Structure formats: C-alpha cells, structure tokens
Amino acid sequence: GSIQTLNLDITKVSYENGAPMVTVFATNEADMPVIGLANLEIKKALQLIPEGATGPGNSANWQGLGSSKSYVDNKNGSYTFKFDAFDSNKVFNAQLTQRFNVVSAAGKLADGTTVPVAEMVEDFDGQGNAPQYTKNIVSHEVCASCHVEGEKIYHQATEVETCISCHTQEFADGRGKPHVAFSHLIHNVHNANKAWGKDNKIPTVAQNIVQDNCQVCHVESDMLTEAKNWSRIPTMEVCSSCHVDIDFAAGKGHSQQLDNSNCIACHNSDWTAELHTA
Ligand code: HEC
Ligand code: HEC
Ligand code: HEC
Ligand code: HEC
Ligand code: HEC
Ligand SMILES: [Mg+2]
C-alpha cells in the first residue's frame, strides 16, 4: 500500500497549563484517517509581531516560541501535541496571532504503507480561534512552477511556509546574518546582483528565468490578504536584497535613512508596482 497525499489539518488549539495543546488530524487523498504516524512534529511554534511594533515602517515578523515532537496518537486519525518547553524566552503574548508549522517526515507505517512528506502552517488568535491579522504574502503554489513538488528546495523542507517559519528576521539577526531572513534570501537567490551561500554562487540561471518579475511569486489571492506587501511595505532589509549597492546608513547611492520610518512616504505602492512591472 502507499499514500499519494498526506493532508494535515489542525482541528483544535487549546491553552491550558498555559502552553498550547494542539490536535492534528491526518488523512490520505481519499479523506481516510491515517493512524500510526511516527514522525509528526510541530516544527515551529511562532507568534506574529505586527507591522510597526519593532519600529516605524517595519514589517510584521515571526517570533519563536519553541517546537514539539511530543504527541499522543489518538488512534482515529488525530494526534495531540504537548510542549515540554514552550516559550522558553517568556515572550508569549495572547494578543498576537499564533502560528503552528506541522510536518510529517516521509516514511512508512507499522504495516509497511509508505507515507509521503507533509507540511502545513495554520494561524490562530491567542486563544485558538480565528486569527485577527496575518502575514500571508506568498503561498507554495508559485514555487511549484519552477521547483519539483514534494522534493526539498535547497534543504530542510518542501513548502515555502515551512521555510518562512524558520528563516525569520529574529533568526537571521540573532546569527549576525540579516541576509538569511526569508524575505531577503528569496530575492537574493534569484537575483544576480549579489552572490549567496557557502559557494558564493552568482544566480545567473535563476536571473535569466525569473528576470526580477515580481508577479511570478507575488500574486493576488483571497487566501493571501497581505499579497500586496511586495509594493506596500518597502524596507531596507528587503529592498536591499537586489538593490545591493545602496548604503542607507552612510548615504551612499541614496539619501541616508537610519530606519524604515519614511520609505513609504516616497516609495508609494503604485510607483513601486509600476516601475518593477514590464
Ligand atoms: C521560475 C519562474 C521560478 C519561481 C517561481 C521560483 N524559483 Fe526558485 N529558482 C529558480 C531557478 C531557475 C533557480 C536556479 C536553480 C539553479 O540551479 O541555479 C532557483 C533557485 C532557488 C533557490 C536556490 C537553489 C540553488 O541555486 O541551488 C531557492 C532556495 C529557491 N529557488 C526557492 C524558491 C521558492 C521558495 C519559491 C517560491 C516562493 C521559488 N524559488 C520560485 C526558478 C524559480
Ligand atoms: C530551520 C528549521 C530551517 C528551515 C525549515 C529551513 N532552513 Fe534554510 N537555513 C537554515 C539554517 C540554520 C541556515 C544557515 C544560515 C547561516 O547561518 O548561514 C539556512 C540556510 C539557507 C540558505 C543559504 C542562505 C545564505 O547563505 O545566504 C538557503 C538558500 C536556505 N536556507 C533556503 C531554505 C529554503 C528554500 C527552505 C524551505 C524549503 C529552508 N531554507 C528551510 C535553517 C532552515
Ligand atoms: C519568488 C522567486 C519571488 C519573486 C520573483 C519576488 N518575491 Fe518578493 N517575496 C517573496 C517571498 C517568498 C517573500 C516572503 C514572504 C513572507 O511571508 O515572509 C517576499 C517578500 C517581499 C517583500 C516583503 C514584504 C513585507 O511585508 O516585509 C517585499 C517588499 C517584496 N517581496 C518585494 C518584491 C519585489 C518588488 C519583487 C520584484 C522586483 C519581488 N518581491 C519578487 C518571493 C519573491
Ligand atoms: C529584485 C527581485 C528586486 C527587489 C526585491 C526590488 N527591486 Fe527595485 N528594481 C529592480 C530591477 C531589476 C530594477 C530596474 C528596472 C528597470 O526598468 O531598469 C529596479 C528598479 C527600482 C527603482 C528605479 C531605480 C532607477 O534606476 O531609476 C526603484 C526606485 C526601486 N527599484 C525600488 C525598490 C524598492 C523600494 C524595493 C523594496 C520594496 C525594491 N526596489 C525591491 C529589482 C528589485
Ligand atoms: C523620498 C524623500 C525618499 C525616501 C524617504 C526614500 N527614498 Fe528610496 N529613492 C527615492 C528616489 C527619488 C529614488 C531614485 C528613483 C530613481 O528614479 O532613480 C530612490 C531610490 C531607491 C531605490 C533604487 C536604488 C537603486 O538601486 O537605484 C531603492 C531600493 C530605494 N530607494 C529604497 C528606499 C527604502 C527601503 C527607503 C526607506 C529606508 C527609501 N528608499 C527612502 C526617494 C526616497
Ligand atoms: Mg543575489
């Protein structure tokens, strides 16, 4: 036997003991329960710092609250996670949107059934109900135009939301490498103005296919309410991924900007959208 698609749905989030308890339901392509998953995990628990809160003009960004591999198989298709060490930095804030990134590793069930990789994110408010605000800009579908589905893109994972959940601005800044925040990295790896990674790769191949065409990734969707952030939210952290010759701090290539407080006053969405579009 072999499962074609593994679907993961979060069916309940409850905060008791403070820490969240999260129930996941696993189904196959025929919507039948999948029991016995041995490699299910909450790869990341996050919360969403809203636009502005880290400073003026700044992007919303994801703050880390931990992860969990500790769960009970409820033997009907559902699995319930607990956290042994939730929010170790003690920043949990029930006012913020909360996200869980759930993944199941490819493998096999007790009876030898093969099961593929699965990944998802879902967002909630601070008590497990619907989220009041989101940062939904891009979804995986666009990457599947040019990257084989179900296979890792570069490393770690197969879907863009998983990448975004680990490659946070906090993660990048904590390691001393702002360029590894996903909103920087993704433009960098497809744009030839600057090399990337351990082999100092110049992305000529990506450049010639993507051609800085924002609309191959940034598309309108009812499911993605922040899709217009690509033109609405100019920051030095992101815009510099391709505009690599500006030094905002020293005023080289541009007037000095010591933060993102005023970018949008000049770089209005209409202008940014129009000038970057063929
Ligand atoms: C075609 C229009 C593309 C879309 C949409 C996306 N990517 Fe892409 N990517 C593309 C090419 C032609 C290449 C270069 C491959 C090469 O071997 O040189 C890439 C590269 C990446 C990489 C770097 C991998 C590498 O150079 O080793 C990553 C990490 C990457 N792409 C991720 C990615 C994601 C997450 C996308 C959706 C948001 C996405 N790409 C779209 C072509 C295209
Ligand atoms: C944490 C759980 C990760 C997930 C999920 C993904 N990545 Fe990752 N990535 C991670 C680390 C710790 C590092 C090293 C960063 C450093 O200190 O150097 C990386 C690195 C990359 C890179 C290289 C970036 C650069 O050097 O400029 C790329 C291109 C990259 N990661 C891409 C990527 C993609 C597309 C992901 C989803 C498919 C992905 N990463 C997930 C940690 C994690
Ligand atoms: C896929 C290869 C992409 C192309 C081409 C472009 N963008 Fe992009 N961008 C993409 C991703 C995966 C993300 C991260 C989304 C997340 O949730 O973190 C982004 C992000 C931006 C942002 C940041 C918005 C914010 O709220 O801070 C901006 C301003 C942005 N992208 C602009 C941009 C422009 C102008 C492009 C064409 C010149 C462009 N993007 C291409 C993926 C890709
Ligand atoms: C790579 C995917 C890019 C990202 C991310 C951003 N921009 Fe960009 N920009 C890009 C290209 C290829 C070009 C040249 C287009 C052309 O027709 O020559 C541009 C150009 C600009 C300009 C005009 C500059 C000029 O030389 O007259 C501006 C003002 C500009 N871009 C702004 C901008 C901002 C504010 C961004 C973050 C939201 C941003 N760019 C991202 C490629 C890329
Ligand atoms: C009005 C006082 C501005 C403020 C505040 C910011 N920018 Fe700007 N920027 C402005 C102009 C008039 C231009 C030149 C446009 C042209 O046609 O050449 C720019 C240029 C940029 C570019 C393009 C740089 C390049 O490679 O040519 C980018 C990416 C850019 N600006 C981004 C940006 C950001 C992120 C800001 C806040 C930190 C910002 N600018 C402030 C006008 C003004
Ligand atoms: Mg680059």
Numbering used by the authors: 44 to 321
The authors write:
All Shewanella capable of EET contain an mtr gene cluster that encodes for MtrCAB, a porin‐cytochrome complex that transports electrons across the outer membrane and reduces extracellular electron acceptors (Fredrickson et al., 2008). An outer membrane cytochrome (OMC) termed MtrC binds to the surface of MtrAB and can directly transfer electrons to extracellular terminal acceptors (Edwards et al., 2020; White et al., 2013). Shewanella oneidensis MtrC is composed of four domains, with the hemes closely packed and distributed evenly between domains II and IV. In both MtrC and OmcA, the first five hemes are located within domain II, and hemes 6–10 are within domain IV.
Site‐directed mutagenesis allowed the production of a truncated MtrC variant comprised solely of domains I and II (MtrCDI,II) that is near‐identical to domains I and II of the full‐length MtrC. Upon sample reduction, there was a shift in the Soret peak maximum from 410 to 420 nm and a sharpening of the α and β bands (maxima at 552 and 525 nm, respectively). These spectral features are typical of redox‐active, low‐spin, bis‐histidine coordinated c‐type hemes, and together with the LC–MS, indicate the protein consists of a soluble MtrC pentaheme cytochrome mainly truncated at amino acid residue 325. X‐ray crystallography was used to determine the molecular structure of MtrCDI,II,sol to a resolution of 1.8 Å. The structure confirmed the successful assembly of MtrCDI,II,sol, including the covalent attachment of five bis‐histidine coordinated c‐type hemes. The orientation of the 10 histidine imidazole rings that form the axial ligands to the heme irons is also highly conserved (RMSD of 0.225 Å), suggesting that the environment of the five hemes was unchanged. The redox potential window of MtrCDI,II,sol was similar to the observed window for MtrCsol measured under comparable conditions. Thus, there is no evidence that either the N‐ or the C‐terminal domain of the full‐length protein holds the majority of hemes with the more negative reduction potentials. The biophysical, structural, and spectroscopic evidence showed that the MtrCDI,II,sol pentaheme cytochrome was structurally homologous to the equivalent domains of MtrC. In our experiments, the addition of a stop codon to mtrC resulted in the assembly of a truncated MtrCDI,II variant, with domains I and II both structurally and spectroscopically identical to the corresponding domains of the full‐length protein. This MtrCDI,II could interact with MtrAB, resulting in the formation of a 15‐heme MtrCDI,IIAB nanowire capable of reducing a limited number of substrates, but unable to reduce the key physiological substrates FMN and Fe(III) citrate. The in vivo catalytic experiments presented here demonstrate that the reduction of physiological substrates requires the full 4‐domain structure of MtrC, yet reduction of certain other substrates is still achievable via the 2‐domain MtrC.
